[PDB]
Design a protein around this ligand. Structure first.
Ligand code: YUA
Lengths: 99, 99
């Protein structure tokens, strides 16, 4: 799709068999989701945003479908204010900025 | 133009007679720029993201040029670690997400 930006670019995602809403965030290097249950192993990781650093659970090679487009990559899980899809997965679904 | 997301979508902007580097950020409602002593009136604001909140100064009707595209709108100035062009200005230069 072509998505204008008068509203937040929110889309439905499928991860671990569960549907969720997430923000397409070109300013995020990484994909960070709010606390949830995800199967498999994970590693403690630190990520920094506008207000400082937080602890997250890093899940590697996770299947995630974004607006009908499949991706397989790293998903960070922790106290982010909102679910964000970052560039690590935006590149997989072929997302570009255009103006 | 078309900007891929392999790397951060950094562009040159002109604001307050100065050139800066900023991210084209679809995850930011509004624009947030590094500390700069802009002239005119402002109102305090608190904005939150990963890690918590920072204090910023809200300036209204500020002229910004983004890759030669002129825009005018709200700019939040404060100790942000990165300059981000948000949707309030991305809409004005005709920026869309496409996949
Ligand atoms: C709310 C969703 C989102 C935060 C998840 C909102 N952010 C925008 C998002 O793109 C930030 C931009 C950024 C900030 C610092 C350093 C680099 C990039 N990226 C982000 O945190 O990415 C994380 C995960 O990947 C990693 O890569 C980069 C950093 C790590 S914001 O900056 O905090 C913001 C902006 C305007 C405004 C607000 C909040 C409130 C009102 C105002 O309009």
């Amino acid at each position: 799709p072509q998505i204008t930006l008068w509203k937040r670019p929110l889309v439905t995602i499928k991860i671990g068999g569960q549907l969720k809403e997430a923000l397409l965030d070109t300013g995020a290097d990484d994909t960070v989701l709010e606390e949830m249950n995800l199967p498999g192993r994970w590693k403690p990781k630190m990520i920094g945003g506008i207000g400082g650093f937080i602890k997250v659970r890093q899940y590697d090679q996770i299947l995630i479908e974004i607006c009908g487009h499949k991706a397989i990559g790293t998903v960070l899980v922790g106290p982010t204010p909102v679910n964000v899809i970052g560039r690590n997965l935006l590149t997989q679904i072929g997302c570009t900025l255009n103006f």
